[PDB]
């Protein structure tokens, strides 16, 4: 039965063993067949095990000589094999869609298990009395080729026998026909086994899919996919609920890793149960829960279904999109499904399949009759498939085996296969591949192992392999731990667990063992004589918490010290034991090693813990110092002297000035050490170095010893070979180098000499010069770079340069004063007392309580003061306090810290504890809603809470606010404190500062708010304040204005209903709640009062206002009255923002009365504070109410008292009498009168020592402004010295025997693209930016496009593009600067730049996803950032006439701030303009989300409101808008400059607005005349000239209308051409030959051009057109002074691209 090769077939024995193939599981590997499973008419269930591809054998002898069996010999053997494959694979490729002849024997390989069927002649087959065994080998063998002879007399060998045939395809090698046998097995009973013999039975190929049909890209018959409710971001997911089937979408990671259940098996309808066929459109399809077996069926909801033979199950998927082509669907495609038996498009169902359990993820879902949606097929890795199944059958073997071994001795072949697994498994671990770690504990392996109740360590190795980042699995071995000792008896295998642990697993490990360690160390020191098991334990010593158990151990080791051998003399026979070991001897010299090894780790296991160690550490004896032995002893002895706590003596503008001076070198090393993880990059910064060129006493005695061993390491650096000798010398050095670094640093000193010591360090770090196995080797060099460019750094960064600063004292203006925050040294003496305060502990009873008392006060007394620079050394004082706080005294010392006057800079540093601080809020929240951790955890909480937007952002509360709100709430929802001390509201409420209102930047709050236990309700009552906490807090979580949930949210739970309880009984609750009862309760009337305010927009929406219609305002009358209101008059400006949200959106929902009067008696009955706040709430009131007019007129009989109240709130006095407290007076009148020109617009659409401090301050501002300004430029030229770059390594570093002097750039380039892998690029990235803008400047600040393209030649445009996307996190606040620099050099040479894109488009996929981002940077700048400065501007200064200008002081600094985000978007415009050229470029490739529309909508967003003559005015008349908009008209204009039909059509359309706005501005092009108007004329026109022309340079009909209809055109264009041509022609005092501007005349001329061009087609344009088209009237003969003095004509076109378009006008108009 014939079938092109690579077809897909099954095949089935008939006769006496009528059956077909069957699989052996993945652990067990043996052929068989359950005749009891199915028919040919009735196919078996488990089908995929029995189908496979039409296999041509493949040539492969090379695996086989190679497999029979310097490397070399076998390397060539194995490479032959690999190749052997290749030709097997290219050859075999040739054998595809190839009808194999019968007797064209064809290999056979096992698609599901993926294994070549194998024929084993020499090994006997067991079950047959004397046959040969048949079994699968993936790699295969030669037996594989099964002779394709045929079975029945009709067919024959050499012929492609037909479609479904018996055949006799026997192996010429097994030599037997393929034997089928009645016999059957005992372990997995279904089956009768399989092997070749001269037997008698008969199979017919039962085809599956076809040859051809094996195209991959289309989801094919039985192909994998994942069933995302994409809208629910939720692969549906049907957990077998309650030991039954639940069918349920899972808690929504669009292509991320889901657990196994996410996927499902695929089937397509075929006339035979068994062939299947090619995915297609008219084909329906049906699917099964492979994990379950049962197929989930729609009792009309998606459910489950044990057997897929019923038809209700099936579903028809209309493609989402219409196919141009053949109907075959494609893989991972997406489409809407109507369950076809149900003939009904299933709808996601909002209810849950578990629901009783709090916050549950299994969810109802089912068939929906209604038509209106689709979800993406997510095709899946067949490989991924194969692995999980191995893990299954593995599991199955493993648990089966467990049952045997626990149960009894299993048999020994069992052992073989099960080891062969065990092996095969450890083998499965074989280096980054996190998925594999998942599958196993996920696939009944992990358990099955532990189950199976050293030879044990094969599992154990399999085990600590995955060990990494895996917290939950670690506790099961508490008990098991003792076993290491008994298994340490067996082998050292169990140690690596304890250490892979130790490293990654720190902390939680520390808890359980306790003095249990004492018995595996007594056991082990008694049983490990070389004590190596013991030793892996000592290396485990990590963390401060270790030192303790460590030391008690020392006591028992004092019992253990005996050793029956000698270490002594003290000097003589140690140095002798060292010459004797110095003989490489065996036996004896052998043993010595242990001790030295033993000695080194544990002794350094000592952290910043000396004393017991500085007491253990006697004789700083160091001579035969050996491997840092000596060094850790001058290091623990250095712990005995001078925790060099910080540095940082001073601050103020000084610091920066110098850092400028350091120039790049500072970078070269900071990038050498701080990046250049890669040796290579650190190293060229070392090229920068070789260029550069130009207890004090008693510690100091140890230090002499030191200074030698360094100069010495330099005469060993005279040895260039740091071959191996540098493993030794380099290690030793290394400890000597952090410790010499650390040696200088604890022991530096303030004169020429630890510095002159640096002068030696020059020749050190220079004398310090300076693949395959070489990376492992390079590790040493690599630590030597963190430590050599740390040593280089720590001395280089802050140590370099402290005297020049104050040396230059001499003096200024007044009289010479060479140096030939007040008493900062009493506060840093009290603060070195802070260090000494570091040192102590709680047992010094004498010292512990008494003396230090509370220095907090100086802290408290100097909090307002500019920070001392050693606050990082003040943060020192903090960190210890992480341990505990039983003693109450905590707080008082602990509070000084809360006293701070610089939160942001610190809070960044304070985030340090974020993990530990989140424990301070989880323990602190375990005891809140000793006291200093809940209160200090809240005082922490607010400092960060009152911070930058990036800071709220840094709450980043996936790790873990759902745990700090959900664990905070797990205890603090039931727990609340009555007024007036209470604090759940605080560590929770500081957090929701989402820019201090409104309802934005709180996206993270639906999911943490989403899994929760609600707050109390109904009868009885609960405790104060945290219900209050509760309500304002609910606002901030569900107040995002962008999603429809907020309505269901401000409703879900509390709903409309809340109102009726805020009528009464909360006063009862608050009176029992506190002494100031009224407080929790006027708080509760605010909380009742504010469901409007937060996402007031997102409250109403599609439909929340209609729901409460007729109830809530009628009810709002009920709480209409109050007083004493200070707090509840905050509930009256919160009942007044509350009260401001009532009538805004009620366009169409009113049938009630008297609401305006209530507020009106309220605002008057007011007493207490100055109206300014209640006259801005009452005034804001009168503007919102006066604006609506005719609706307000329907609402009541009259509002006459509201014009006198509006005129008395608007009229007032100096406060309303004489307060005299404001001074930006033209701002206020000003905005108020174009918000009253705005309001005017709204009404028709109606329906001895301090002198040291100060003269120092002054010489610092004068020398400051002088020095800093002048100096930066020459540094920019010397920066430009690196810009020789390629020529610089050739000068001097002239690089002989071909060394690579030129072209240094391209390499450094890739290097830094990798360096930003560090989350902090910091100034480093920015420092790069500066020089690029100065590389435009080799052509400028002094060819530049061979430099622009030179980079682009030597790694260019590509690296920087690929790099611009990290600007999200790193670089948001330089992404602006970054952008500018990139555009400059490139601009003017898009030749270069095409290459850029030319390289870019390639990564088609890797390019395509990325396109959306900038658009949401604009877009994301776009809609918000219009709102921000634009409308406050719109109220434009001062809309009152002209002949104390008081123009608001300092408006410009501010506007510069608001358009910082805007300005990002803006330079963005200029560059978009500069790079563009070819159309493909302009085309915005088939990206994910590439809508030029966003340009039209940000363009359209400050525009926004401006239908007529343009009267944002203010915002129009506002300046930053203009640069932005013109370059958006030149970017936008280079985009339409290509006049793509679909671009011009697209633009006016998708903005649907931007366009029209463009039209209306020029028809009142500015009302404010002047220099600002003049520019408004040139841009308003030349940008409009160019752009309008570009969009209109085409012929269709559809693209012209959307724009012409915008203008009263003939009259707007002809009265604007007579008012602009007239306003413009009349003066004629302009500058001549203005290459530069011609404004009103090449612009107005551009209107004559526009009018001109519209005359291709239509009739309304002939209508505008006959007034140029004729006449003798003056304005049509001025309009004739154009047609003759405008060109009024168009040029001859050969037609570009493909002989296409016709014409457009070219200026030539004398």
XYZ file of N, CA and C in Angstrom, residues 1110-1293:
552
model
N -31.777 57.363 39.471
C -32.946 57.717 40.268
C -32.801 57.348 41.741
N -31.803 56.563 42.123
C -31.593 56.226 43.519
C -30.623 57.167 44.223
N -29.403 57.339 43.699
C -28.279 57.874 44.472
C -28.283 59.388 44.658
N -28.889 60.165 43.761
C -28.994 61.601 44.023
C -30.132 61.884 44.986
N -31.300 61.294 44.718
C -32.377 61.274 45.697
C -31.854 60.862 47.065
N -30.967 59.866 47.102
C -30.348 59.485 48.364
C -29.299 60.501 48.800
N -28.709 61.238 47.854
C -27.683 62.195 48.239
C -28.304 63.379 48.968
N -29.593 63.622 48.742
C -30.299 64.588 49.576
C -30.232 64.188 51.048
N -30.164 62.882 51.317
C -30.297 62.406 52.687
C -29.099 62.828 53.535
N -27.884 62.713 52.999
C -26.690 63.163 53.718
C -26.281 64.578 53.309
N -27.259 65.457 53.103
C -26.970 66.773 52.545
C -26.519 67.773 53.582
N -26.602 67.450 54.860
C -26.460 68.478 55.868
C -25.406 68.075 56.885
N -24.595 69.058 57.275
C -23.583 68.882 58.307
C -23.002 70.224 58.741
N -21.929 70.183 59.578
C -21.255 71.361 60.118
C -20.039 70.977 60.951
N -19.476 71.945 61.730
C -18.267 71.680 62.533
C -17.246 70.955 61.702
N -17.375 71.203 60.406
C -17.003 70.272 59.371
C -15.504 70.237 59.085
N -14.696 71.178 59.613
C -13.249 71.149 59.326
C -12.768 69.814 58.757
N -12.907 68.755 59.564
C -12.656 67.381 59.129
C -13.735 66.883 58.164
N -15.005 67.141 58.456
C -16.049 66.779 57.497
C -16.338 67.870 56.459
N -15.605 68.993 56.493
C -15.557 69.976 55.416
C -14.364 69.685 54.536
N -13.441 68.869 55.022
C -12.714 67.989 54.124
C -13.636 66.915 53.578
N -14.589 66.438 54.396
C -15.696 65.716 53.769
C -16.695 66.645 53.128
N -16.377 67.926 52.947
C -17.148 68.822 52.095
C -16.337 69.418 50.952
N -15.021 69.250 50.920
C -14.240 69.347 49.688
C -13.953 67.979 49.088
N -14.239 66.927 49.862
C -14.331 65.517 49.503
C -15.786 65.092 49.414
N -16.669 65.750 50.164
C -18.032 65.886 49.665
C -18.181 67.027 48.692
N -17.103 67.734 48.348
C -17.176 68.692 47.258
C -16.420 68.252 46.014
N -15.566 67.246 46.119
C -15.096 66.563 44.918
C -15.941 65.330 44.644
N -16.209 64.570 45.708
C -17.449 63.828 45.832
C -18.615 64.607 45.269
N -18.857 65.821 45.794
C -19.987 66.609 45.300
C -19.734 67.149 43.898
N -18.476 67.177 43.448
C -18.232 67.610 42.080
C -18.495 66.501 41.074
N -18.600 65.246 41.521
C -18.763 64.209 40.524
C -20.180 63.829 40.147
N -21.186 64.614 40.551
C -22.572 64.157 40.450
C -23.160 64.436 39.070
N -22.958 65.639 38.540
C -23.691 66.108 37.365
C -22.847 66.265 36.102
N -21.603 65.808 36.113
C -20.740 65.959 34.944
C -21.234 65.096 33.784
N -21.352 63.785 34.006
C -21.610 62.805 32.956
C -23.089 62.505 32.745
N -23.980 63.194 33.451
C -25.409 62.927 33.336
C -25.989 63.707 32.156
N -25.558 63.325 30.960
C -26.108 63.919 29.747
C -27.564 63.517 29.550
N -27.909 62.267 29.864
C -29.172 61.690 29.426
C -29.814 60.786 30.475
N -29.859 61.234 31.744
C -30.359 60.338 32.779
C -31.108 61.050 33.919
N -31.853 62.122 33.634
C -32.376 62.979 34.693
C -33.897 63.075 34.685
N -34.505 62.858 35.854
C -35.938 63.071 36.077
C -36.174 63.334 37.558
N -35.564 64.393 38.100
C -35.691 64.724 39.519
C -35.262 66.173 39.737
N -35.245 66.601 41.000
C -35.259 68.033 41.265
C -34.578 68.358 42.586
N -34.468 69.678 42.835
C -34.053 70.387 44.046
C -32.591 70.153 44.396
N -31.810 69.525 43.514
C -30.428 69.201 43.899
C -29.532 70.421 43.978
N -29.743 71.414 43.116
C -28.891 72.600 43.116
C -29.105 73.436 44.364
N -30.322 73.446 44.897
C -30.609 74.296 46.047
C -29.907 73.791 47.304
N -29.878 72.469 47.504
C -29.239 71.898 48.694
C -27.791 72.365 48.836
N -26.971 72.117 47.807
C -25.579 72.584 47.812
C -25.516 74.071 48.121
N -26.531 74.808 47.673
C -26.490 76.264 47.680
C -26.736 76.802 49.077
N -27.699 76.241 49.792
C -27.786 76.593 51.201
C -26.572 76.073 51.964
N -25.980 74.971 51.500
C -24.793 74.427 52.185
C -23.641 75.442 52.163
N -23.240 75.884 50.963
C -22.046 76.719 50.819
C -22.184 78.019 51.608
N -23.410 78.486 51.820
C -23.610 79.710 52.584
C -23.600 79.436 54.080
N -24.332 78.401 54.513
C -24.393 78.012 55.918
C -23.004 77.726 56.459
N -22.037 77.701 55.540
C -20.644 77.517 55.880
C -20.163 78.629 56.789
N -19.314 78.239 57.734
C -18.517 79.168 58.503
C -17.070 78.787 58.346
N -16.272 79.123 59.359
C -14.909 78.574 59.509
C -14.000 79.184 58.433
N -13.306 78.373 57.641
C -12.069 78.821 57.010
C -12.259 79.804 55.860
N -11.190 80.422 55.351
C -11.342 81.343 54.224
C -11.961 80.624 53.048
N -12.881 81.320 52.411
C -13.574 80.761 51.264
C -12.626 80.187 50.205
N -11.440 80.779 50.028
C -10.513 80.410 48.950
C -10.599 78.926 48.595
N -10.619 78.055 49.612
C -10.804 76.624 49.379
C -12.271 76.286 49.118
N -13.197 76.853 49.902
C -14.625 76.633 49.667
C -15.191 77.590 48.621
N -14.412 78.595 48.190
C -14.747 79.445 47.049
C -14.092 78.969 45.777
N -13.124 78.072 45.883
C -12.639 77.304 44.747
C -13.376 75.984 44.574
N -13.977 75.452 45.640
C -14.901 74.321 45.516
C -16.296 74.808 45.155
N -16.748 75.876 45.816
C -17.962 76.571 45.412
C -17.792 77.281 44.075
N -16.586 77.774 43.778
C -16.332 78.425 42.492
C -16.233 77.402 41.368
N -15.368 76.399 41.543
C -15.370 75.270 40.621
C -16.800 74.794 40.385
N -17.586 74.740 41.467
C -19.015 74.459 41.360
C -19.691 75.385 40.346
N -19.524 76.702 40.511
C -20.276 77.638 39.675
C -19.820 77.623 38.214
N -18.585 77.213 37.934
C -18.177 77.125 36.534
C -18.741 75.869 35.883
N -18.722 74.744 36.608
C -19.289 73.522 36.043
C -20.795 73.655 35.847
N -21.476 74.351 36.759
C -22.926 74.490 36.639
C -23.287 75.556 35.611
N -22.540 76.662 35.572
C -22.803 77.708 34.587
C -22.515 77.240 33.170
N -21.638 76.244 33.010
C -21.279 75.793 31.668
C -22.412 75.011 31.008
N -23.226 74.301 31.806
C -24.180 73.357 31.227
C -25.438 74.074 30.729
N -25.865 75.112 31.433
C -26.969 76.000 31.063
C -28.283 75.254 30.842
N -28.535 74.770 29.619
C -29.901 74.366 29.301
C -30.323 73.084 30.007
N -29.359 72.210 30.313
C -29.648 71.069 31.162
C -29.931 71.513 32.597
N -29.074 72.388 33.142
C -29.374 73.029 34.418
C -30.730 73.736 34.364
N -31.106 74.259 33.192
C -32.413 74.905 33.067
C -33.550 73.887 33.159
N -33.369 72.701 32.579
C -34.382 71.666 32.753
C -34.445 71.204 34.207
N -33.315 71.223 34.917
C -33.252 70.603 36.244
C -34.047 71.361 37.305
N -34.154 72.683 37.192
C -34.869 73.475 38.182
C -35.569 74.632 37.488
N -36.448 75.306 38.234
C -37.130 76.465 37.671
C -36.145 77.573 37.314
N -35.202 77.883 38.205
C -34.280 78.991 37.974
C -33.002 78.806 38.787
N -31.953 79.518 38.365
C -30.651 79.580 39.024
C -30.170 81.020 39.104
N -31.088 81.944 39.408
C -30.743 83.359 39.456
C -29.818 83.670 40.628
N -30.024 83.017 41.774
C -29.117 83.185 42.909
C -27.726 82.638 42.629
N -27.568 81.840 41.572
C -26.273 81.276 41.218
C -25.426 82.221 40.371
N -26.036 83.245 39.758
C -25.282 84.295 39.074
C -24.784 85.377 40.016
N -25.563 85.692 41.062
C -25.079 86.568 42.124
C -24.085 85.866 43.038
N -24.290 84.567 43.314
C -23.297 83.794 44.057
C -22.047 83.540 43.235
N -22.207 83.305 41.934
C -21.051 83.205 41.055
C -20.339 84.543 40.915
N -21.078 85.651 40.993
C -20.476 86.974 40.889
C -19.907 87.488 42.205
N -20.294 86.906 43.344
C -19.704 87.268 44.631
C -18.549 86.345 45.000
N -18.610 85.068 44.612
C -17.402 84.255 44.687
C -16.383 84.752 43.666
N -16.855 85.191 42.495
C -15.940 85.706 41.475
C -15.516 87.149 41.742
N -16.255 87.878 42.568
C -15.998 89.302 42.794
C -15.109 89.544 44.018
N -15.525 89.015 45.186
C -14.759 88.973 46.440
C -13.927 90.219 46.774
N -12.865 90.041 47.585
C -11.911 91.107 47.900
C -10.475 90.579 47.842
N -9.625 90.941 48.810
C -8.205 90.568 48.828
C -7.940 89.185 49.423
N -8.989 88.487 49.835
C -8.985 87.124 50.361
C -10.464 86.900 50.488
N -11.056 87.872 51.167
C -12.397 88.375 50.952
C -12.420 89.649 51.797
N -11.206 90.086 52.158
C -10.966 91.262 52.995
C -9.523 91.772 52.931
N -8.523 90.973 53.377
C -7.137 91.465 53.464
C -6.010 90.502 53.877
N -5.978 89.251 53.396
C -4.958 88.313 53.885
C -3.576 88.571 53.277
N -3.503 88.752 51.951
C -2.315 89.272 51.251
C -1.199 88.234 51.103
N -1.512 87.064 50.543
C -0.603 85.923 50.636
C -0.150 85.318 49.312
N -0.469 85.921 48.159
C -0.051 85.369 46.867
C 0.578 86.441 45.991
N 1.403 86.014 45.043
C 2.176 86.988 44.288
C 2.382 86.667 42.810
N 1.859 85.574 42.275
C 1.918 85.334 40.830
C 0.677 85.890 40.159
N 0.419 87.178 40.400
C -0.933 87.692 40.232
C -1.399 87.645 38.777
N -0.498 87.833 37.798
C -1.011 87.737 36.427
C -1.273 86.289 36.005
N -0.652 85.284 36.650
C -1.044 83.884 36.434
C -2.518 83.713 36.725
N -2.940 84.179 37.901
C -4.291 83.901 38.385
C -5.363 84.618 37.552
N -5.370 85.962 37.546
C -6.242 86.697 36.640
C -6.131 86.086 35.248
N -4.917 85.600 34.903
C -4.563 85.306 33.519
C -5.228 84.021 32.983
N -4.812 82.906 33.561
C -5.534 81.662 33.394
C -7.020 81.845 33.666
N -7.399 82.657 34.665
C -8.825 82.767 34.964
C -9.583 83.419 33.819
N -8.913 84.236 33.003
C -9.629 84.927 31.938
C -9.480 84.276 30.574
N -8.596 83.292 30.387
C -8.841 82.442 29.228
C -9.441 81.091 29.613
N -9.636 80.845 30.920
C -10.650 79.909 31.408
C -11.998 80.598 31.567
N -12.040 81.926 31.460
C -13.281 82.678 31.306
C -13.498 83.113 29.861
N -12.466 83.076 29.032
C -12.664 82.959 27.589
C -12.981 81.516 27.220
N -12.414 80.568 27.971
C -12.834 79.174 27.848
C -14.284 79.017 28.303
N -14.600 79.578 29.473
C -15.973 79.538 29.971
C -16.901 80.292 29.029
N -16.450 81.448 28.528
C -17.197 82.155 27.486
C -17.520 81.209 26.337
N -16.565 80.349 25.972
C -16.789 79.435 24.852
C -17.823 78.352 25.177
N -17.941 77.938 26.441
C -18.719 76.731 26.728
C -20.251 76.888 26.643
N -20.816 78.110 26.704
C -22.237 78.297 27.053
C -23.242 78.103 25.907
N -22.832 78.192 24.645
C -23.791 77.971 23.566
C -24.020 76.495 23.315
N -22.994 75.664 23.521
C -23.116 74.215 23.377
C -23.792 73.643 24.611
N -24.914 74.231 24.980
C -25.602 74.034 26.220
C -26.880 73.234 26.017
N -27.090 72.160 26.804
C -28.179 71.234 26.571
C -29.002 70.893 27.758
N 31.326 85.120 64.660
C 32.609 85.058 63.985
C 32.734 83.896 62.981
N 31.978 82.813 63.168
C 32.202 81.566 62.420
C 31.286 81.392 61.201
N 30.053 81.889 61.303
C 29.137 81.764 60.183
C 29.684 82.476 58.949
N 30.567 83.466 59.138
C 31.175 84.135 57.986
C 32.124 83.198 57.237
N 32.841 82.328 57.960
C 33.496 81.203 57.301
C 32.513 80.487 56.402
N 31.389 80.048 56.982
C 30.398 79.313 56.179
C 29.961 80.068 54.925
N 29.826 81.383 55.004
C 29.164 82.164 53.965
C 30.128 82.670 52.902
N 31.260 83.246 53.293
C 32.240 83.657 52.281
C 32.817 82.425 51.592
N 32.872 81.300 52.308
C 33.108 80.043 51.603
C 31.993 79.772 50.592
N 30.727 79.880 51.036
C 29.601 79.739 50.111
C 29.797 80.602 48.868
N 30.378 81.791 49.039
C 30.416 82.770 47.956
C 31.568 82.497 46.993
N 32.788 82.329 47.516
C 33.891 81.898 46.664
C 33.536 80.621 45.915
N 32.635 79.811 46.486
C 32.179 78.598 45.825
C 31.172 78.872 44.709
N 30.305 79.884 44.851
C 29.423 80.209 43.723
C 30.177 80.968 42.632
N 31.213 81.734 42.992
C 31.933 82.552 42.014
C 32.990 81.723 41.291
N 33.886 81.103 42.051
C 34.747 80.070 41.488
C 33.936 78.962 40.823
N 32.744 78.662 41.349
C 31.921 77.602 40.770
C 31.493 77.975 39.361
N 30.668 79.025 39.254
C 30.197 79.505 37.956
C 31.355 79.752 36.993
N 32.487 80.231 37.516
C 33.673 80.473 36.698
C 34.279 79.172 36.189
N 34.722 78.341 37.122
C 35.524 77.170 36.805
C 34.728 76.147 36.009
N 33.590 75.706 36.558
C 32.880 74.574 35.965
C 32.472 74.870 34.522
N 31.923 76.065 34.278
C 31.472 76.438 32.936
C 32.609 76.361 31.908
N 33.751 76.997 32.195
C 34.848 77.014 31.231
C 35.391 75.614 30.952
N 35.444 74.737 31.954
C 36.264 73.522 31.828
C 35.697 72.402 30.960
N 34.372 72.295 30.842
C 33.787 71.112 30.218
C 34.175 70.993 28.752
N 34.403 72.125 28.088
C 34.571 72.126 26.635
C 35.863 71.412 26.238
N 36.982 71.778 26.872
C 38.256 71.142 26.532
C 38.199 69.644 26.789
N 37.486 69.247 27.839
C 37.188 67.840 28.054
C 36.379 67.251 26.901
N 35.572 68.064 26.221
C 34.830 67.532 25.079
C 35.739 67.374 23.862
N 36.812 68.164 23.794
C 37.771 68.007 22.705
C 38.685 66.817 22.957
N 39.091 66.632 24.209
C 39.910 65.485 24.569
C 39.101 64.205 24.489
N 37.807 64.299 24.769
C 36.901 63.217 24.422
C 37.051 62.914 22.948
N 36.912 63.955 22.123
C 37.212 63.845 20.699
C 38.625 63.352 20.433
N 39.458 63.183 21.463
C 40.754 62.562 21.200
C 40.600 61.060 21.020
N 39.820 60.418 21.883
C 39.468 59.035 21.621
C 38.904 58.838 20.230
N 38.292 59.881 19.653
C 37.592 59.780 18.370
C 38.535 59.575 17.190
N 39.826 59.856 17.348
C 40.777 59.269 16.419
C 40.625 57.755 16.443
N 40.612 57.186 17.657
C 40.253 55.802 17.933
C 41.129 54.810 17.197
N 40.772 54.519 15.961
C 41.466 53.529 15.161
C 42.895 53.986 14.914
N 43.116 55.288 14.674
C 44.501 55.771 14.488
C 45.312 55.818 15.775
N 44.643 55.780 16.937
C 45.337 55.972 18.208
C 46.100 54.723 18.627
N 45.470 53.555 18.544
C 46.248 52.352 18.775
C 47.346 52.186 17.721
N 47.291 52.885 16.580
C 48.382 52.759 15.604
C 49.546 53.676 15.967
N 49.268 54.939 16.244
C 50.230 55.740 16.982
C 50.610 54.991 18.258
N 51.878 55.003 18.648
C 52.302 54.401 19.927
C 51.992 52.932 20.087
N 50.728 52.564 20.245
C 50.406 51.148 20.331
C 50.521 50.469 18.985
